[PDB]
Amino acid sequence: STDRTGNIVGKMIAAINAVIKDEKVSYSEYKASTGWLISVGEKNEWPLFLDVFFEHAIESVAAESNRGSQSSIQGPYFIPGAPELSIPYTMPMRDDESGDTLIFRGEVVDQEGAPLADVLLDMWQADAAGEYSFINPTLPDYLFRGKIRTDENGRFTLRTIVPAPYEIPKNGPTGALLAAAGWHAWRPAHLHWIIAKEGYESLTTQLYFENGQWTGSDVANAVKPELLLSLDKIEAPHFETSYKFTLGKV
C-alpha cells in the first residue's frame, strides 16, 4: 500500500515535473493553473474533469478482466433510484418531448449464448438538446432515466428518443480548460447502461450510433468499435435498433 501509493503517485508527480522543465512552464502559468485547480473544486467539477480525461484509462485496465461483452466508462451523471418502468417500456419523457423516436430491442445472454431472465438494467441518457435530468435541474426529475428487466427470453423492448451529443459546459473550469487547450468539448450521442444479475459480474457500458457526429473524436475517449449501433429508419419516421449484451458468471 505505502509502497504502491508511493510508486504510482511518485511517477505521476515526476512526469508532471518533467513537462514543466521541458516546456519551461512559467510562474505566471503556475499561478493561473493554481487558480484554475481551485475553481474545479469550488464548481464541484472534480468528477466531471477526472471522468473526461482519466476514467477511460482506469476503465481500460478494468476491462482486461471482462467476462462478458464490451464495457465503457460510467461518467459523472449516474443517479441512483431511477424509476422501475412498466411494459411497454418507455423512458421517462414529457408529453411534447423533442427528438426522433428510437425503439431499442435488447437481448442479454450468458457466456453460452443462453438468454438471462430478470436481468436488471439501469439506463440513462441526455435529451434531444443534450441535457440530463438532475444535472440540469430545470428538467423534470428522472427524465430519461429508468430501470427495466429482461424477459424469460432475455429480452426487452424500450422506447426512447435518440439523444443529442453532449458538450462539457463552457461556463465551467473543465470547459474553460478545453477551450484554453484548443480541444473540442463534445461527446457523441450515447446511451448509458448498468446491467446486473445476482450471480453474474455486472456490466457498465455505453452505446453509440454508427457514423454519429463525434464518434471518432470523443472528448472522453470512451468509444470502442463493439459499441456502435446501426439504426434502421422505419416509416409510419422513427428509428429501430438492437443490441445483445453478455454477462459473465461470478
**Residues placed in the known binding site for Fe(3+):** 132, 190, 192
User: Among 10, 11, 13, 18, which residue interacts with ligand LPP (rule: CB under 6 A)?
Assistant: 13
C-alpha to C-alpha distance for 192 and 102, rounded to whole angstroms: 15
Closest CA to 250 of 67, 33, 11: 67
Q: Using CB under 8 A, which residues numbered 160 to 219 contact a second copy? A: 177, 180-183
Largest CA distance in the chain: 64
By the rule CB under 6 A, 166 interacts with ligand BHO: yes
By the rule CB under 5 A, 146 interacts with Fe ion: no
Residue 161 has which C-alpha cell? 428518443
By the rule CB under 6 A, 5 interacts with ligand LPP: yes
| Min CB(66)–Mg ion separation in Å | 5
DSSP secondary structure string for all residues of 76-130: S---TTPPBP-SSEE----TT--S-EEEEEEEEE-TTS-B-TT-EEEEEE--TTS
By the rule CB under 8 A, 80 interacts with a second copy: no
User: Among 191, 220, 227, 247, which residue interacts with ligand BHO (rule: CB under 6 A)?
Assistant: 220
Residue tagged 466531471 (cell numbers)? 48
Q: Give the footprint of Mg ion on this chain (CB under 5 A).
A: 65-66
Q: In the complex, which residues of this chain contact a second copy (CB under 8 A)?
A: 1-13, 15-27, 29-30, 33-34, 37-38, 40-42, 46-47, 50, 53-62, 177, 180-183
